[PDB]
């Protein structure tokens, strides 16, 4: 869906 | 001494963690007053703080630190590091599977790829303290990413993020373009956006070259992009916060509980629906001129409005606080805090035996919570549990929610301790039924690293 | 001819299934007028109808039917049949694992146990039609249990149920006691109740001896108990409906969707919470004098009120309708409906099949087989017609059945569902082409969701 | 308390 | 009276269910002697029994029965009925979703499709008894399919099945072609084969036109196909048995248990492997001239051969018997069996009350298992359980495994009853410690429908 | 220079990792010859090696190291550290939930509890290298625990473990008692044992006071216990290996595959069972005199014997090798191996990266980085090279890592794995093209699975 | 994989 | 009895 900045410190 | 190192030394001399957090944020946007920032700019405007001091962030993070962590730590592509490049108006990700060794990483950088470290706070203790302190005054998890871009290149396609972002220029310079929300719906967006092409963009509300020391803040929904121009790379650390911390999120948790409460306490919510409402309600009847329908919708609006009286606002506030405690990075203690806590007890190993044995609390011991934002008292299914952060990992949700049960005869004293910080309370004066309960609560919290004493225990 | 058999023969002559449902319910509470029952008694008062006709229900269900079921069907204890008794203020369940054979069941009955059949509509086509028709005017699933109690015994402990109940006395006599809701929380109760002891009960609001033909109705929340006294057993069929069909349930489905819509459409719902609200909100702070707390609460109530404007009411109505179709017992067709449907086509194996290949034509006149067998629901940019004609007489035994309706047929499908029982010339269906008209009608008909004015004779 | 009367015709 | 009805009447007059099963199979292949059939043809040869009696199967199943079950039962496409056709050397399946109403089914038949009923025994009680009896002498689940093919058509592509098949021609005629296994591996195949084209086939070992009354048997692995020629349809019922009931299947269950037993009882199986066997074992070393390797393989062969001494053969036999009891169709009682069992107790409802109340067993009651293949005593985890078939559904595995625990003081008597069928045993003479145990076992089994009495109970 | 530091310095000078592993084990049991230990003592006898050198292990692990770990690392009770004590013939575990801080740990120690570190190799790079090297000559995972006991106490109850154990006395003194397997079933036991009481034990086969430098080895199944007597504590590191690495386990993996292969390839395994074998087989029939039963048993034993011929022995060996690679601790590189690998390439951030873009060429000479870091395994018509270089020092923390090898490189991959430590000119790799040679070598090298004779200087 | 005769009386 | 000695370095 689009995720550029990884706030939680990890991908999904 | 650099400004960052000066303020960090300064924080260590500040007793309250609440005040420490406030002071560090003050430093972050200086000279801009925090009160003005939150009142007028937070979630409303893009802001550039032209520092005119290239040494401002020295000690926070550098490219040397990155290089060293690639060789000394187990940095994995995908999980910890991304390598991307934006060319031809197209985003490409080049992560090879496996470990991101210096040879591979720098090879990608040399070919035009930007490198992005997802959890710098897991490899750097400076970044960790920085975010651990700031999270206390955000009242929200403070995450971060580090971006290293080679000269004459763009790593990512324009997009907007789902968080409040504070960009800290650490090395080199970078041409940034920030655009205001394109439409009503993109204002304070809920989710990250897809990658946009330039044709999807209007005019930048902000276009400038950031210089080490500079700060650039912008709300979620504000599209941005950035590029390195001739001859110099760019390294910056983006601090992020406020992910899904909206009023709508609060309502999401509230509503199911409200309607359940209403149904259990007010018969109007338990009455049966019409036997024939399917005759005039439904997409097939969106244009029915049946008044029964108007009456149906009106009743719906009335009952919904009513739910406000049944909303368990305090319980949802506690739940969110509990999830924030779980989200939290563990505390970074001041020399004094450590020295007056179980963490600093002088007991260790020398020769063949433990030395400086058995310090013990007494009713005369003056105590208070180790810090203000490390614990939260919550009620669940007839029980009370104190959730704390002191055993959380620097990695988001690596360790699960930690708590310890608080027995009824200790609830008053636990609430007291939680609300008097940083005021000292003689253990003997804690609102408990027996002295056994006073010493027991203070001992359990102290041994847990949730409490500190006025004078270091020496018994 | 018993009144039941007479009203059923009469239903077979009533063209509309909607009218048919209304008529059977009217028969169910006669002489009491339905309008009056729903306006003044439904969900409000306990009602007793002294029929003065021991034969009123003749043909619905008897103890001879239960006996034959035991010998001729796979009746299981627990699953299909329960055996209980109430003694010394204690409820005891005496189910042997396994199948309930005549020997075991009647032995328990002889020992003073009441036998209760959980799904007589799965074993009796009469009880099935009865419930299948009534469900159409309740707009809610209609279930039932049969209760058989031996003389001088009480099978169950006083309790209130979670459904609207219509007790129909079939055989013998039974002393019933019905009580008004003990407290405000028990009125129109959400869930069934624990077993109560006599010390828990106040004075009955209705105490009477039910006799075959009589009817007793009482809302969920109304505690009740019943005992057989000296010399005669009791057999009754309790008809149930309206399980979790309240306004609260509707809201339950509405709210999540409402809040999501509000967040997507109005920025006030997407604004951040205060950075320090945890300092004044929480059980820890319920008596705080912080003005911020009062502002926080007010804002919560204002935003919640606003939600009414974003509530997708029609979509939830459709979802509940879809669930109801899934819940529904399959339809009972009249001789006419069958004769004019695919179910009655004379095609059969009479060494080769005879009379097959009959076709619909633009001249064929059609209309939905019945009024409550289908529902058009939109999900993810797609339209699906959910129906009941393939449902099992056993609750949720088969999963939701539906067929997709293409946009080029949507208008005609709504029309057909909307104009029952008016006959519509297939050629006059609001479709783009003649192919679309013929294909929609052929499809529905082959599914058994449609009937023609004249039996397809092609 | 349990469903004294089993509305849906099967125990749960 | 037709031969089928004559033999069925005959079975009702035969006391033993074991003998009943043997007699029915005798009837099935008459005039061929069963002893010759099993000795020489079973699993070895294709067999045609040209009956010369078109009435042989009358009463078993007919097309009229099919038509009627489509309108009176809930026959579903896919789940209960398939419609297929073989044309252009290609198989096609035409199952519409949903109920298979007469109009749809016959429409498909008219267009050339064959119809196949998957579980005729669930809709026909005649087919049910037929298979329920035959399963007792097969010692394996006996299933069946019904095939109706229209004139001038083929429904399925040539293939072979994974079961022993007995084709019973019921109506019309059909040209069959049976081929012997094409290769060593296809002999007594384990799984159904893919659809074959004619090019994949050799010469038929059997090619003939079946006539109502005829029987055609062939082993799993034997490819077959069949077609209706001019002017007449075909209806046949294929009885199937022996699916995965091989020696290899027995070993599959045995081995894990054998090796575990060996490891627990013999130290040679617990010794450690070589520290360096990976140096000479592995696909990469399949050609190593290292003798250590030859020694490795030799040791493997020795230990494997050894496992024979540790194989729990009786326990696996019991497990398979338990699974067969679970697989079994429920018994079809003879008038006498029903009349002398709980199923036939005269207690029912008349007027307002139960009549013919309370017959009870006494030590004088002479009993014996209702039938020989309806129960099996099995040991599991220190407990003994009697699994039975009397509550099984006519639908394969619709109801789960049913059993009742047998207490230690009843085990001897339960074994006795299981091994003396059909010899009568006075309840008082059952090997039990107390009389309470004798009456209790007999009462529990009787009430379960697992026992019958010499004289109908009348108490 | 302590003997440990001296042998490690010596290992850094030994070219082959295989030779390096053999040398460290030789050092571990010196003066006893390895050949002799494995031929006569391994899995057979308890062995005591009186070193007569209190400094033999200096540098491996000390109590000061454990202390610093407690203060400077996230050591958790239960997960990383256990605290137990044995009193009145009763074992008690005293773990507080949460992290084990110096205060808590030493308080328990002062109260007479033994502290046991479950994975010192995750906290010490020395213990890690030690185990990483030894695992290469065991051909099995090498784990370890550290045990610290206070003076005058017994931390654990007598028991036998499920692994081959080498106790290394690090500090203090401890009275050990080792017993031979109580019964035939306990010899080379499969699983760990329950806690035993003194009444369960016979006479020790070995009773001695271990002193720093000493080594004690005993096979799984050998019960043991140990206590600290007056005035001194004890600290020891127990090295473990060979957990479920028996012939029985191999067979376990072999059999299912064997029987399946037999069934697919030989018709005797596909023939039907007797139609009536249930009449004579079963516990019910164990004493039957039916000859059929004897024939049935004989047939079972003959078919089982035949299985040996269908056993896919090499495939199981490969599967166990793959599991071992997954089990393995990551490799410890010598200064040379690093300097000649991708790990030592001088490329670094010295405002731009320096010295990058180095390339392999057909002239480059290469060979596997080490001997036990990789394994080639075939699965479903595909070849995968599984390696250990990215494994965590924590058991199974990361899942199996592998990269696919294409058939056009299979021969060269086997060659490289087979000729270590012989240097192979990349151009002479048995590949179809020069592209294949260059790509295989480049890939392996970039993964850190290969080294060059000369440091890539390009 | 190919299943022509449905021995167990149902598909898969 | 349990793994007195935790060979794999983590409890289970
Ligand atoms: O640096 C870039 O090219 C993009 N950076 C970001 O999107 C950010 O910091 O949130
Ligand atoms: O008949 C009884 O004893 C109890 N009956 C009921 O509770 C009922 O019909 O809902
Ligand atoms: O009848 C057919 O066309 C095929 N029949 C079968 O494959 C069978 O009976 O096993
Ligand atoms: O040290 C102890 O008390 C017990 N030690 C062991 O069991 C061991 O090292 O395997
Ligand atoms: Mn961004
Ligand atoms: Mn009730
Ligand atoms: Mn076939
Ligand atoms: Mn041990």
Q: Which chains touch B (3 or more CB pairs under 8 A)?
A: A, C, F
Rounded to an integer, what distance in angstroms lies between the CA atom of residue B240 and that of residue B163?
6
CA distance F162 to chain H (A): 8
From the CA of C236, which ligand is nearest?
2
Q: How many CB atoms lie within 10 A of CB E209?
A: 13
From the CA of F157, which ligand is nearest?
4
Q: Which of E98, E147, E153, E145 is nearest to E123 (CA)?
A: E145
Q: How many CB atoms lie within 10 A of CB E429?
A: 12
| CB proximity F398 to H under 8 Å | no
Which structural domains are found in chain E, ordered by start? 1-246 (2.60.120.650), 247-310 (1.10.10.1500), 311-459 (3.90.930.40)
Q: How many CB atoms lie within 10 A of CB C66?
A: 22
Q: Which chains touch F (3 or more CB pairs under 8 A)?
A: B, E, H
Chain B residue with minimum CA distance to F72: B343
Q: How many CB atoms lie within 10 A of CB F206?
A: 17
Q: Which residues of E143-181 are buried (b: 16+ CB within 10 A; e: fewer)?
A: bbbbbbbbbebbbbbbbbbbbbbbbbbbbbbbebbbbbb
Eight-state DSSP code of residue F99:
B
The rounded Å distance from CA B146 to ligand 5 centre is 11
What approach was used to elucidate this structure?
X-ray
The answer to whether the beta carbons of residues E214 and E50 sit under 8 Å apart is yes
Rounded to an integer, what distance in angstroms lies between the CA atom of residue F284 and that of residue E377?
8
Cα dist. E181→B79, C332, E158 in Å?
55, 53, 13
| Interface F-H: count of C-beta contacts within 8 A | 57
Could you give the 3-state DSSP secondary structure of residue B354? strand
Structure tokens at C322: 């879809």
CA distance D4 to chain C (A): 7
Backbone φ and ψ for F197, nearest 5 degrees, come out as: -110, 165
Q: Is the CB of B238 under 6 A from ligand 1?
A: yes
Could you give the 3-state DSSP secondary structure of residue C278? helix
Q: Do chains F and A touch (3 or more CB pairs under 8 A)?
A: no
Q: Which of E244, E141, E319, E258 is nearest to F300 (CA)?
A: E258
The rounded Å distance from CA D5 to ligand 6 centre is 5
CA-based radius of gyration for chain G = 7
Residue-wise DSSP of C343-394: GG---EE---EES------TT-EEEES-SSSEEEEEETTEEEEEESTT--SS
Rounded to an integer, what distance in angstroms lies between the CA atom of residue F299 and that of residue F374?
43
Distance of CA A1 to the CA centre of its chain: 11
CB contact under 8 A, D10 and C238: no
Structure's resolution in angstroms: 2.3
Backbone φ and ψ for F446, nearest 5 degrees, come out as: -65, -25
| Residue nearest to ligand 1 atom 9, measured at CA | B238
SS3 readout for chain E: CCHHHHHHHHHCCCCCHHHHHHHHHHHHHCCCCHHHHHHHHCCCCCEEECCCCCCCCCCCCCHHHHHHHHHHCCCEECCCEEEEEEECCEEEECCCCCECCHHHHHHHHHCCCEEEECCHHHCCHHHHHHHHHHHHHHCCCCEEEEEEECCCECCCCCECCCCEEEEEEEEECEEEEEECCCCHHHCCCCCCCCCCCHHHCCCCCEEEEECCCCEEEECCCCEEEEEECCCCCEEEEEEEECCCCEHHHHHHHHHHHHHHHHHHHCHHHCCECCCCHHHCCCHHHCCCCCHHHHHHHHHHHHHHHHHHHHCCHHHHHHHHHHHHHHHCCCCCCCHHHHHCCHHHCCCEEECCEEECCCCCCCCCCEEEECCCCCEEEEEECCEEEEEECCCCCCCCCCCCCCEEECCHHHHHHHHHHHHHCCCCEEHHHCCCCCHHHHHHHHHHHHHHCCEEECCCCCC
CB contact under 8 A, E349 and C103: no
Q: How many CB atoms lie within 10 A of CB C328?
A: 24
Q: How many CB atoms lie within 10 A of CB C361?
A: 11
Could you give the 3-state DSSP secondary structure of residue F368? strand
Q: Is the CB of B178 under 6 A from ligand 1?
A: no
The rounded Å distance from CA B147 to ligand 1 centre is 7
Distance of CA C336 to the CA centre of its chain: 25
Rounded to an integer, what distance in angstroms lies between the CA atom of residue E247 and that of residue F269?
5
Q: For a substitution probing ligand 3, which of E112, E215, E225 has the most ligand atoms within 8 Å of its CB?
A: E225
| Residue nearest to ligand 1 atom 2, measured at CA | B226
Q: Is the CB of F155 under 6 A from ligand 4?
A: yes
Chain B residue with minimum CA distance to F173: B352
Q: Who's near B196: CB < 8 A, 6+ residues apart?
A: B157, B158, B159, B223
CA distance D12 to chain C (A): 9
Structure tokens at C69: 């079921």
Structure tokens at C404: 């997709």
Distance of CA F432 to the CA centre of its chain: 38
Q: Which chains touch G (3 or more CB pairs under 8 A)?
A: E
Rounded to an integer, what distance in angstroms lies between the CA atom of residue A9 and that of residue B117?
9
Structure tokens at B14: 């500040």
The rounded Å distance from CA F161 to ligand 7 centre is 57
Q: Is the CB of C161 under 6 A from ligand 2?
A: yes
Mutate to test the interface with E, among C349, C452, C455 (most CBs of E within 10 A): C349
Pairing of β B215-218 and β B47-49: antiparallel
Nearest to E193 among G2, G10, G11 (CB): G2
Q: Which of C187, C176, C179, C167 is nearest to C228 (CA)?
A: C176
Rounded to an integer, what distance in angstroms lies between the CA atom of residue E103 and that of residue E117?
16
Rounded to an integer, what distance in angstroms lies between the CA atom of residue B337 and that of residue B359?
17
Nearest to F122 among H2, H3, H9 (CB): H9
Q: Which of E69, E388, C305, E284 is nearest to B302 (CA)?
A: C305
Inter-axis angle of helices F291-306 and E247-265, to 10 degrees?
80
- N-terminal to C-terminal alpha carbon distance within chain C: 40
Structure tokens at F423: 């240097």
The answer to whether the beta carbons of residues B162 and A2 sit under 8 Å apart is no
Q: Who's near B289: CB < 8 A, 6+ residues apart?
A: none
Q: Do chains C and D touch (3 or more CB pairs under 8 A)?
A: yes
Measured between beta carbons, which residues in chain C are less than 8 angstroms from residue B163?
none
The rounded Å distance from CA E192 to ligand 7 centre is 9
Give the dihedral sign, CA B50/B55/B58/B61.
positive
Q: Who's near C398: CB < 8 A, 6+ residues apart?
A: C390, C391, C392
Q: Which chains touch E (3 or more CB pairs under 8 A)?
A: C, F, G
Rounded to an integer, what distance in angstroms lies between the CA atom of residue E227 and that of residue E225?
7
| Residue nearest to ligand 2 atom 10, measured at CA | D5
Rounded to an integer, what distance in angstroms lies between the CA atom of residue B149 and that of residue F352?
11
Closest ligand 2 atom to residue C165 Cα is: 10
Q: Is the CB of B226 under 6 A from ligand 1?
A: yes
Residues flanking ion ligand 5, Cβ below 5 Å: A 4-5; B 161
CB contact under 8 A, H5 and F145: yes
Q: Do chains E and D touch (3 or more CB pairs under 8 A)?
A: no
Mutate to test the interface with F, among H2, H3, H4, H11 (most CBs of F within 10 A): H4
Could you give the 3-state DSSP secondary structure of residue B355? strand
The answer to whether the beta carbons of residues C136 and C371 sit under 8 Å apart is yes
Rounded to an integer, what distance in angstroms lies between the CA atom of residue F146 and that of residue C333?
80
Those residues of chain A whose CB sits closer than 8 Å to some CB in chain B are 1-11
Residues flanking ion ligand 7, Cβ below 5 Å: E 161; G 4-5
Mutate to test the interface with H, among F122, F196, F240, F330 (most CBs of H within 10 A): F240
Nearest to E121 among G1, G5, G9 (CB): G9
Rounded to an integer, what distance in angstroms lies between the CA atom of residue B67 and that of residue A5?
21
Rounded to an integer, what distance in angstroms lies between the CA atom of residue B71 and that of residue B62?
15
Mutate to test the interface with E, among G9, G11, G12 (most CBs of E within 10 A): G9
Measured between beta carbons, which residues in chain G are less than 8 angstroms from residue E145?
5-6
Q: Which of B269, B260, D3, B263 is nearest to C192 (CA)?
A: D3
From the CA of C225, which ligand is nearest?
2
Q: Is the CB of B144 under 6 A from ligand 1?
A: no
Structure tokens at C362: 């633009």
Rounded to an integer, what distance in angstroms lies between the CA atom of residue B257 and that of residue B253?
7
Nearest to F104 among B97, B99, B447 (CB): B447
Q: Who's near F389: CB < 8 A, 6+ residues apart?
A: F330, F331, F369, F373, F401, F447, F448, F449
CB contact under 8 A, F284 and E251: no
């Amino acid at each position: 869906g689009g995720c550029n900045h990884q706030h939680i410190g990890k991908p999904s | 001494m650099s400004p960052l190192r000066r303020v960090l030394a300064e924080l260590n001399r500040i007793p309250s963690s609440r005040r420490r957090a406030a002071r560090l944020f003050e430093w972050l946007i200086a000279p801009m007053p925090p009160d003005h920032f939150y009142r007028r700019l937070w979630e409303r405007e893009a802001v550039l703080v032209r520092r005119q001091d290239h040494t401002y962030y020295q000690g926070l993070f550098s490219t040397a630190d990155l290089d060293s962590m690639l060789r000394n730590e187990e940095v994995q592509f995908g999980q910890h590091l991304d390598a991307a490049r934006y060319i031809n108006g197209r985003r490409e990700t080049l992560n090879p599977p496996g470990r991101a060794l210096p040879a591979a990483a720098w090879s990608l950088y040399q070919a035009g790829c930007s490198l992005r470290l997802l959890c710098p706070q897991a490899f750097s203790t400076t970044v960790w303290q920085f975010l651990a302190v700031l999270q206390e005054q955000f009242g929200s998890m403070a995450g971060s990413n580090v971006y290293l871009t080679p000269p004459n290149s763009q790593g990512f396609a324009p997009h907007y993020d789902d968080i409040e972002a504070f960009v800290l220029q650490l090395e080199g310079r970078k041409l940034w373009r920030v655009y205001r929300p394109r439409a009503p719906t993109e204002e304070l967006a809920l989710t990250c956006s897809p990658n946009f092409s330039q044709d999807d963009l209007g005019e930048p509300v902000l276009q400038t070259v950031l210089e080490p020391g500079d700060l650039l803040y912008f709300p979620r929904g504000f599209i941005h992009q950035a590029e390195c121009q001739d001859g110099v790379h760019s390294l910056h650390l983006t601090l992020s916060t406020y992910q899904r911390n909206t009023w709508g999120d609060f309502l999401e948790a509230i509503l199911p509980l409200a309607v359940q409460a209403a149904m259990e306490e007010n018969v109007e919510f338990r009455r049966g629906l019409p036997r024939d409402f399917m005759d005039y309600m439904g997409a097939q009847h969106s244009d029915s001129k049946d008044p029964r329908r108007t009456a149906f919708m009106e009743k719906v609006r009335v009952l919904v409005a009513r739910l406000g009286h049944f909303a368990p606002v305090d319980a949802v506030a506690d739940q969110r606080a509990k999830d924030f405690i779980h989200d939290s990075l563990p505390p970074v203690l001041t020399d004094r805090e450590r020295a007056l806590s179980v963490y600093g007890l002088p007991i260790r190993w020398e020769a063949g035996e433990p030395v400086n044995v058995g310090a013990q609390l007494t009713t005369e011991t003056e105590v208070h919570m180790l810090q203000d934002g490390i614990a939260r008292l919550v009620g669940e299914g007839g029980h009370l549990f104190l959730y704390y952060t002191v055993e959380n990992s620097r990695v988001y949700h690596l360790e699960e929610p930690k708590c310890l049960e608080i027995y009824p005869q200790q609830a008053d004293a636990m609430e007291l301790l939680l609300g008097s910080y940083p005021e000292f309370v003689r253990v003997g004066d804690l609102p408990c039924d027996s002295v056994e309960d006073q010493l027991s609560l203070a001992t359990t919290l102290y041994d847990k690293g949730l409490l500190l004493t006025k004078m270091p225990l020496a018994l």
